[PDB]
Amino acid sequence: AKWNPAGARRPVLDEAPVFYPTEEEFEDTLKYIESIRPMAEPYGICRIVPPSSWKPDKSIWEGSKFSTRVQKVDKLQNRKFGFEPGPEFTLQTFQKYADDFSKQYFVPSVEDIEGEYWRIVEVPTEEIEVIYGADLETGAQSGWNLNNLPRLLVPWVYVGMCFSSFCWHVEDHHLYSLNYMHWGAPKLWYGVPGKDAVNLESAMRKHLPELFEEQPDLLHNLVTQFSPSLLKSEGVHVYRCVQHEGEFVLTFPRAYHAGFNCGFNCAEAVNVA
Ligand SMILES: O=C(O)CNC(=O)C(=O)O
Ligand SMILES: [Fe+3]
């Protein structure tokens, strides 16, 4: 039903690296990624802010329908078999649903929302359910237009609202993931480097044993959130970054990531080799 500010459980984490390419570096997507890899790879994830140069509809906004799934945020980590289908929406109607939910639940800052999100997942006091559009199949000249990367695997669309989540997972086939936020509220990302994958899975098996018994293949299901604070206590390196609209997040082969949204937003991501 509503916010408890004093009950906040915001993770205390190191920030993932942020990159500010120049127009020249930016002119070659694949080449730029390659160049920052040595620096960014040990973190599993990184944020890329495009230069000023870079700069990318009623019938769609109001016309194109998509379906959603329902998430019980209070059950993502602690529960005694996943995301049921939700209503169909358009961007317009989804936004209004999304905006009213936040207005009533709570203008909070990103850190306010993040502290509340983890309160709901670690120590819930009520059922909170939320809706997201994921897996929506779409729908200069540079690979930053995600539709062009498979060339030089198809782009996928994500519509989020406050507290909607993407639970811990690695990309298929040790692929990179490149994610662009088209517009809307910030998305919180938590990343673990490939070399720490074993520590992460093992921390999860240790603390959520009964969950693994009934679902031996949890780690593939995308249905389980797990606190960075718990990970941190098991010696796992978790890095945070906050993605704003107009910004990319890049995930490295074999890196685990998870996160949630601070409000209504729209993003597109693709896998790259
Ligand atoms: O954007 C989301 O909600 C989730 N995206 C991913 O997990 C992907 O970019 O690797
Ligand atoms: Fe992903």
Numbering used by the authors: 139 to 194, 200 to 223, 262 to 287, 296 to 328, 350 to 362, 378 to 498
From the reporting publication:
Our results demonstrate that JMJ703 is essential for plant cell division and stem elongation and specifically demethylates mono-, di-, and trimethylated H3K4 in vivo and in vitro. The c-JMJ703 molecule presented a canonical overall folding of JMJD2 proteins and contained four of the five domains defined in the structure of c-JMJD2A: the JmjN domain (A139-K199), the long β-hairpin (D200-T271), the mixed domain (L272-V377) and the JmjC domain (L378-A498).
The high resolution structure of the catalytic core of JMJ703 (c-JMJ703) in complex with cofactors and substrate peptide reveals that the overall folding of c-JMJ703 is similar to those defined in animal and yeast JMJD2 that are H3K9 and H3K36 demethylases. The final model was best at a resolution of 2.35 Å with a final Rwork value of 19.3% (Rfree = 22.5%). The electron density indicated the presence of substrate peptide in the c-JMJ703-NOG-H3K4me3 complex. Three of the ten residues in the H3K4me3 peptide (ARTKme3QTARKS) were visible in the c-JMJ703-NOG-H3K4me3 complex structure. Compared with the structure of c-JMJD2A in complex with methylated H3K9/H3K36 peptide, the methylated H3K4 and its two flanking residues adopted a different binding conformation to c-JMJ703.
